[PDB]
Design a protein around this ligand. Structure first.
Ligand code: SF4
Length: 208
């Protein structure tokens, strides 16, 4: 039950931070995961985006947003004229949490508890201290609550620029849906979910 804090080194070097996250024992999730999935991008990024946790594909690659949700994220970024390669993209929890299907190898993603999110939050703080983003997009409720408190309501602040204490640099925060949700439902449901995410990404990119 320790939390990640005493496993986080005092450095802004992202490769050093990523290796240290591989050695983190701040919660139980390191055990069955393949590896840490640290954030991806350069310190030169001025927009950071934060999801929930790895999926199966992310866990195998050691990279964020490489599966189907990442594909739809990329499509929405393109619609918002945002270059993904200029971003820093990461997740609130850095080890894949899952159960195995009975009788097989298939891994079923399971959502981190609030305790696991808080345990892993010091890595987000180190990432923000390193990258110094102007704006942070919180992709989904888990990432939003990680910075804005466990009773934060994404539905009550769509399109709003937020700020909160204990976030390095006091960046603009924009809380939106997680891109996995854009995979759901028939044509018009997907198209409305897409539009809503694009609107929020544009708010974030237009912060000046
Ligand atoms: S999930 Fe986060 S806190 Fe838990 S072990 Fe992995 S890095 Fe450490």
């Amino acid at each position: 039950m320790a939390g990640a804090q005493d496993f986080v080194p005092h450095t802004a070097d992202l490769a050093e931070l990523a290796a240290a996250a591989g050695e983190c024992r701040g919660c139980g999730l390191y055990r069955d995961a393949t590896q840490a999935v640290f954030g991806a991008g350069g310190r030169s990024a001025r927009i950071m985006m934060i999801g929930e946790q790895p999926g199966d594909k992310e866990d195998l690659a050691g990279l964020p947003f490489v599966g189907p949700a990442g594909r739809l994220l990329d499509r929405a970024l393109e619609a918002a004229d945002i270059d993904r390669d200029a971003l820093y993209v990461t997740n609130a929890v850095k080890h894949f949490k899952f159960t195995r299907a009975a009788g097989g190898k298939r891994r079923i993603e399971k959502t981190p508890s609030r305790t696991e999110v808080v345990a892993c939050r010091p890595w987000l703080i180190a990432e923000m201290t390193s990258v110094e983003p102007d704006v942070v997009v919180l992709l989904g409720a888990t990432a939003a609550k990680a910075l804005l408190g466990n009773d934060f309501r994404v539905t009550q602040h769509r399109g709003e620029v937020l700020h909160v204490d204990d976030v390095p640099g006091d960046p603009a925060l924009v809380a939106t849906v997680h891109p996995s949700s854009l995979l759901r439902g028939p044509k018009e449901e997907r198209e409305s979910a897409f539009a809503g995410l694009v609107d929020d990404l544009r708010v974030a990119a237009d912060v000046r």
